[PDB]
């Protein structure tokens, strides 16, 4: 379908774009503007030429699925290499943005371990 | 929810202004 994935036919295009990794609510409301496409249209109601236009536009305006993930890991991996505190935090699986490690680090630490 | 910045709800609860809650 689209760059790496598919949007459900039964959903509007706005939510449709969002299922792409690297596409949130913001750009979703944007590609419709830059492609002049009705947001209210379901994916089951989308025309080929509009889609390929959509496909052509968005899939080069940004990198979304694989090309986007690599930069993240590239950024993250290089931090481990540079030994930065940020990278230092990642190598411990700890909250890298200065959060409080003493309590409430579950989202970064997952299951609690007595 | 209230704690979501991107919602105008959040910037109300958070008490801020931005792309999603102008003045």
């Amino acid at each position: 379908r689209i760059a790496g994935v598919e949007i459900p036919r039964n959903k509007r295009v706005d939510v449709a774009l969002t299922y792409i990794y690297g596409i949130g609510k913001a750009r979703a409301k944007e590609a419709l503007e830059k492609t002049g496409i009705n947001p209210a249209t379901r994916v089951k109601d989308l025309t080929e030429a509009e889609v390929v236009r959509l496909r052509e536009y968005v899939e080069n305006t940004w990198k979304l699925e694989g090309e986007l993930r690599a930069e993240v890991a590239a950024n993250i991996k290089r931090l481990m290499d540079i030994g930065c505190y940020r990278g230092l935090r990642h190598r411990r699986g700890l909250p890298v943005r200065g959060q409080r490690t003493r309590t409430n680090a579950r989202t970064r630490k997952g299951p609690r371990k007595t | 929810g209230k704690g979501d910045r991107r919602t105008r709800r959040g910037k109300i609860w958070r008490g801020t202004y931005g792309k999603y809650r102008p003045r």
Partner: protein, 181 residues
């Protein structure tokens, strides 16, 4: 038999290009595609969904040729598979279906690959025989996402008349296999 553009590319340019590149004394000295083997070592249907013939149907769609079933050559404790148990499908595409399937592969299958930076330039037998693998089966245009239910990858063993991997990768390169390196 039937006409296939890619094979036509083999005769038209690939043959003379290889001959120039190597000066083969005889045209039988130049590489060729013996066959193209397709494997799916499922390892899942052997226990449950033992009629996953639907997967064989997918192979038939991609190949126009129903694959034969491969069973366990012996039982295993770890691999929960008693001997004589279907564990993987297999089809052997040859001349016409060979060039056809390969043509759909390069023209569509590879460019549909997620983050396809190219083929391994190293996945060679050593005898001039290339192998590779897939993690899903919805790459091929015959297969649609609607018809797909589970991602069965596969393996492809393209065998070549050539003796070295040199002339092999030379050939498929002339065939335009996009090598990631």
């Amino acid at each position: 038999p039937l006409d296939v553009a890619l094979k036509r590319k083999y005769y038209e340019e690939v043959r003379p290009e290889l001959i120039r590149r190597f000066g083969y004394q005889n045209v039988w000295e130049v590489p060729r595609l013996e066959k193209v083997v397709i494997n799916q070592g499922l390892g899942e249907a052997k226990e449950d969904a033992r009629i996953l013939e639907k997967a064989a149907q997918e192979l038939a769609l991609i190949t126009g040729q129903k694959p034969a079933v491969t069973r366990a050559k012996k039982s295993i404790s770890n691999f929960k598979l008693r001997k004589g148990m279907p564990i993987g499908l297999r089809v052997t595409l040859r001349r016409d279906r060979m060039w056809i399937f390969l043509e759909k592969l390069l023209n569509v299958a590879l460019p549909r690959i997620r983050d396809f930076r190219g083929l391994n330039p190293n996945s060679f037998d050593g005898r001039g025989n290339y192998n590779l693998g897939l993690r899903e089966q919805l790459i091929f245009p015959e297969i649609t996402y609607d018809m797909v239910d589970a991602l069965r990858g596969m393996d492809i063993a393209v065998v070549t008349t050539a003796e070295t991997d040199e002339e092999a990768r030379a050939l498929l390169e002339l065939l335009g296999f996009p090598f990631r390196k």
